[PDB]
Amino acid sequence: QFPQFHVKSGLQIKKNAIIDDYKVTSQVLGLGINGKVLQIFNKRTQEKFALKMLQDCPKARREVELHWRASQCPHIVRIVDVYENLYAGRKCLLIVMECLDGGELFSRIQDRAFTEREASEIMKSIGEAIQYLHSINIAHRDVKPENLLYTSKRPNAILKLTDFGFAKETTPYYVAPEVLGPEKYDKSCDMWSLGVIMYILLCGYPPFYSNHGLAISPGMKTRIRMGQYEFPNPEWSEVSEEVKMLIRNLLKTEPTQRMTITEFMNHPWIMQSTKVPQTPLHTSRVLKEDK
Ligand SMILES: C[C@H]1CNC(=O)c2[nH]c3ccc(C(=O)Nc4nc(C(=O)NCCN(C)C)cs4)cc3c21
């Protein structure tokens, strides 16, 4: 009668040199805020891991903490251990994470081909990451395609959300959610980035791009501010006008008009991914030709 499974363990930070437990190669797997990710090896199991190197301070401390909490979610990259060591005398935190070999979301899409129903199933999985986060009052605030790596190159490899460098915390019965903690509008710009990734998912380019010799509001940044974009053919010719209408509710200019991660997930095109059009999509050839 009690949520036993709801007790997860809080972080125990190892303070011995991480070079007892891992070989640490000089080779970089990626780059993220505050940290380069080197590839390391467990010295005992010889298994292969990702190491991010932050330098101690309330930013660093905050990433480890927030991220440790989100580590439980299946769709967020799993933390193996966190070490607090002395790196040349200056003190820093070391995050050891699982490895993700499937590449970025888009790279592992840019070779085949990709259909709507398949993008819907993909958009759902990112949504679960985002819906878990907001349910524990964390906003990621840098959800981009480069923060999305696949575990393996198997067809059954998971899509996982990396990097908590910019992630931030957001804090009777008929009481209203305002009173129960004001909560800014941070979860909001995850919802925006979800649209941007939904948009780039279906056609193969971003809704906002660089072009200056035109008519009204040239700036890459003015098009963002105004909310000036739309869905060209052919790329969008046959794309569900239900789906376009969904992308209209995340790419709202006004943060208060956007769709909440819950509304997003309950919304049909996501929820029932397994009963949307299986119709073709230009992504694979669009995203390939351009580059
Ligand atoms: C992303 C980078 C951005 N920010 C993060 O906080 C972050 N956390 C991560 C955890 C695991 C991996 C990971 O699994 N990386 C891997 N990368 C490769 C790889 O093949 N890299 C090649 C890149 N190089 C040739 C330029 C294999 S596994 C990358 C991460 C990143």
Q: What CATH number does residue 151 fall under?
A: 1.10.510.10
* Cis status, amide bond into 234, omega within 30 of 0: yes
Rounded to whole angstroms, the Cα distance separating 11 from 81 reads 9
Report angle CA 267, 133, 223 to the nearest 5 degrees: 65
Rounded to whole angstroms, the Cα distance separating 65 from 71 reads 10
Q: Any binding-site annotation on 35?
A: yes
Confirm or reject: Cβ of 97 under 6 Å from ligand 1.
yes
| Polymer length of the chain | 291
Q: Look up tokens 């679960």; give the residue.
A: 128
Q: What are phi and psi of 58, to 5 degrees?
A: -55, -25
Contact 125, 159 (CB under 8 A): yes
Q: Which residues are catalytic?
A: 142
Q: Look up tokens 């437990």; give the residue.
A: 21
Ligand 1 geometric centre to CA of 190 (Å): 21
Domain match, 92 and 108 both: no
Instruction: Please report, for residues 167, 199, 201, 208, 223, the alpha-carbon distance to residue 229 in angstroms, rounded to integers and kept in the order given.
Output: 27, 11, 16, 7, 7
Residue 7 counted as domain residue:
no
Name the DSSP class of 104: E
Residue 5 counted as domain residue:
no
Instruction: Please report, for residues 53, 194, 211, 232, 280, the alpha-carbon distance to residue 284 in angstroms, rounded to integers and kept in the order given.
Output: 34, 19, 24, 17, 10
Q: What are phi and psi of 243, to 5 degrees?
A: -75, -35
Nearest residue (by CA) to ligand 1, atom 16, is: 29
Rounded to whole angstroms, the Cα distance separating 55 from 32 reads 14
Residue 208 counted as domain residue:
yes
Contact 75, 161 (CB under 8 A): yes
Number of structural domains in the chain: 2
Domain match, 115 and 247 both: yes
Rounded to whole angstroms, the Cα distance separating 192 from 251 reads 5
Residue 9 counted as domain residue:
no
CA nearest to 102, candidates 27, 207, 29: 29
Q: Any binding-site annotation on 133?
A: no
Report the Cα 264 to chain-centroid distance in Å. Answer: 15
Contact 49, 98 (CB under 8 A): yes
Contact 239, 245 (CB under 8 A): no
Rounded to whole angstroms, the Cα distance separating 67 from 162 reads 9
- String of b and e for 17-45 (b: at least 16 CB within 10 Å)? ebeebbebeeeebbebebbebbbbbeeee
Scanning the chain, the segments in alpha helix (DSSP H) are 58-70, 116-135, 188-202, 220-226, 241-247, 261-266, 268-271, 283-289
Domain match, 78 and 172 both: no
Confirm or reject: Cβ of 51 under 6 Å from ligand 1.
no
Question: Which residues partner with 90 through β-bridges?
Answer: 87
Question: Which residues partner with 93 through β-bridges?
Answer: 84
Contact 81, 14 (CB under 8 A): yes
Confirm or reject: Cβ of 71 under 6 Å from ligand 1.
no
Q: Letter for the amino acid at 172?
A: P
Q: Any binding-site annotation on 100?
A: yes
Domain match, 82 and 117 both: no
Residue 3 counted as domain residue:
no
Nearest residue (by CA) to ligand 1, atom 1, is: 30
Ligand 1 geometric centre to CA of 37 (Å): 6
CATH number at residue 25: 3.30.200.20
CA nearest to 95, candidates 84, 106, 105: 84
Domain match, 231 and 281 both: yes
Per the structure, the complete domain to which residue 74 belongs is given by: 18-99
Mutate to test the pocket of ligand 1, among 25, 28, 33, 37 (most ligand atoms within 8 A of CB): 37
All residues at 6 or more sequence positions from 65 whose CB lies less than 8 Å from its CB, including other chains = 11
Ligand 1 geometric centre to CA of 48 (Å): 12
CA 77 to ligand 1: nearest atom = 10
Ligand 1 geometric centre to CA of 136 (Å): 26
Confirm or reject: Cβ of 99 under 6 Å from ligand 1.
yes
- Given 48, 70, 99, the domain boundary residue is 99
